[PDB]
């Protein structure tokens, strides 16, 4: 008879990498080595873009008491490319950092800083007792206590409004159970652990859905056509045969997708030209045999 057996597949010959022309490094010093951090209820947000980051040196430092990532692995960040990065900086008490992770509730998670449930980023914190806490106590670090209702992720409110925990309305400035919602921490050095002031930085970079700006340090190789190769275009990984195309990408376009959500055209990030992608060959293998009682 004729029997079907294993399949076959052409194997890739070599690997390609194409990355942008970014040279300048990122302003991490301006974030981690700043003089002054704002209060939790007025956290500060800086936007990082158009540089070449190096997250390894951040991960290899021992200064950090907590370095936890939620949608990526800290090892891989160095070969991923991003569209924009955000840095949120503030200062909190030593034991509330637990509330900052996504999905939990409590004082801070309900009144000061809420993280979405689909968070993709990294949370960093380390205790900075001596640098800012003083025997008199740098009490300008104050947080909110009571609020109208929970605030949605990445919200912020600055106001002098007075709160009425009581039933009756309260006017003027103060009254019976008419509370000024902001309250200052008790930060001073001889205080024990768990009440020390900790500094927190949150990175909330976005993924693989738009023209990217921040890449890691991976250097580009040349371009090879008409051979099964492994390609890596700005973090888009794959395998196939590259070719010169006839599709007329408009200037704002960067990809071309399939019915099954697979890219089948691309634009080279250095020489802006359009390349087709076609997968290598595959097929079955049938063996035709007379009986083994007749011959081998």
């Amino acid at each position: 008879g004729i029997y079907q057996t294993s399949n076959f597949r052409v194997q890739p010959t070599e690997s390609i990498v194409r990355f942008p022309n970014i040279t300048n490094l990122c302003p991490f010093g301006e974030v981690f080595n700043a003089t002054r951090f704002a209060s939790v209820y007025a956290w500060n947000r800086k936007r990082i873009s158009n540089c070449v980051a190096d997250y390894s040196v951040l991960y290899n430092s021992a200064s950090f008491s907590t370095f936890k990532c939620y949608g990526v692995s800290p090892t891989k960040l160095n070969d991923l490319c991003f569209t924009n990065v955000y840095a949120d900086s503030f200062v909190i008490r030593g034991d509330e950092v637990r509330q900052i992770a996504p999905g939990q509730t409590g004082k801070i998670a309900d009144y000061n800083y809420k993280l979405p449930d689909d968070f993709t980023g990294c949370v960093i914190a380390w205790n900075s007792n001596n640098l800012d806490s003083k025997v008199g106590g740098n009490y300008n670090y104050l947080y909110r206590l009571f609020r109208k209702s929970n605030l949605k992720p990445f919200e912020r409110d600055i106001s002098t409004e007075i709160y009425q925990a009581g039933s009756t309305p309260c006017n003027g400035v103060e009254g019976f159970n008419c509370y000024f919602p902001l309250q200052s921490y008790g930060f001073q050095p001889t205080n024990g652990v768990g009440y020390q002031p900790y500094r927190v930085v949150v990175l909330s970079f976005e993924l693989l859905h738009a023209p990217a700006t921040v890449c890691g340090p991976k250097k580009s190789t040349n371009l090879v056509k008409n051979k099964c190769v492994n390609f890596n275009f700005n973090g888009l990984t794959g395998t196939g045969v590259l070719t010169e195309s006839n599709k007329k990408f408009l200037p704002f376009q960067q990809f071309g997708r399939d019915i099954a959500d697979t890219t089948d055209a691309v634009r080279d990030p250095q020489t802006l030209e359009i390349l087709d992608i076609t997968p290598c060959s595959f097929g079955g293998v049938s063996v035709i045999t007379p009986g083994t009682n007749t011959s081998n």
Binding site: R47, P211, K247, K248, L250, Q253, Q254, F255, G256, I259
Partner: protein, 281 residues
């Protein structure tokens, strides 16, 4: 500096029909020869668009809301529409965005502005030198703290032109989502008199900005001693976007050529559920 100009006629609002206008490219992914169903904020077909006009007389620049987007359109000559304010208080306690396509530059600013009641730019008129020259910039008087800023390359636009019927057709779609301000636009010449053109055309994206402000109101800045002036013949139209699924048709060139508004009436809904532009008995 700014003046309260009042000499002009008073009229009630006028309403018109938006046949098949206000469809744009929702993403930056190439697609060709295919029908794709997409959900987003579009301008519904056969909708009621407000109409304002500056003719000879008529000069109305009222505060208009900005809810979940705006489809602005202008049929115009001589480049009279030039500016846009956007803000939530407009009064010195919150930042406001300014876009100005003035004669020399294209300026974009995000500043702690302070405007007044009648902000506007204005060009004098044909004073025997064969040119209209910018002499009026009475928009704002205070600017405290301003984060973003941008001045594009210098240039010179036309400030003259005489014809009874407009040929400049500008469409713009303005969106503000994820703290990002998106501007889509398109230019076209058409032979129209006093209404909105009937036809179909898509809007390629033009700009994104990472601004991050809260906008609830906006106001146009039109091109014009303290009173007495002449209006350029121009009409401009306002409509508002809503969340509504569409079925889009890409041809070989990946060029959007038709759309189906997928809740307009039962026939459109059946076209959606079959994913075709033609249905059989």
């Amino acid at each position: 500096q700014c003046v309260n100009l009042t000499t002009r006629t008073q009229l009630p609002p006028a309403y018109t029909n938006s046949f098949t206008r206000g469809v744009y490219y929702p993403d930056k992914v190439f697609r060709s020869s295919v029908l794709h169903s997409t959900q987003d904020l579009f301008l519904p077909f056969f909708s009621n668009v407000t109409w304002f006009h500056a003719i000879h007389k008529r000069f109305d620049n009222p505060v208009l809301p900005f809810n979940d987007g705006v489809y602005f359109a202008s049929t115009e000559k001589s480049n009279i529409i030039r500016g846009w304010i956007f803000g939530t208080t407009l009064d010195s306690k919150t930042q406001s965005l300014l876009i100005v396509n003035n004669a020399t530059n294209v300026v974009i600013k995000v500043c702690e502005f302070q405007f007044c009641n009648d902000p506007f730019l204005g060009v004098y008129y044909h004073k025997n030198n064969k040119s209209w020259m910018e002499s009026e910039f009475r928009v704002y008087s205070s600017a405290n703290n301003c984060t973003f800023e941008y001045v594009s390359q210098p240039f010179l636009m036309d400030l003259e032109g005489k014809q009874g019927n407009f040929k400049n057709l500008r469409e713009f779609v303005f969106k503000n989502i994820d703290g990002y301000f998106k501007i889509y636009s398109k230019h076209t010449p058409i032979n129209l008199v006093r209404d909105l053109p009937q036809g179909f055309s898509a809007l390629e994206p033009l700009v994104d900005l990472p601004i991050g402000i809260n906008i609830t109101r906006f106001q146009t800045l039109l091109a014009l001693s303290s009173s007495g002036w002449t209006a350029g013949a121009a009409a401009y139209y306002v409509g508002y976007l809503q969340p509504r699924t569409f079925l889009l048709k890409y041809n070989e060139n990946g060029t959007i050529t038709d759309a189906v508004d997928c809740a307009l009436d039962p026939l459109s809904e059946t076209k959606c559920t079959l994913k075709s532009f033609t249905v059989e008995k």
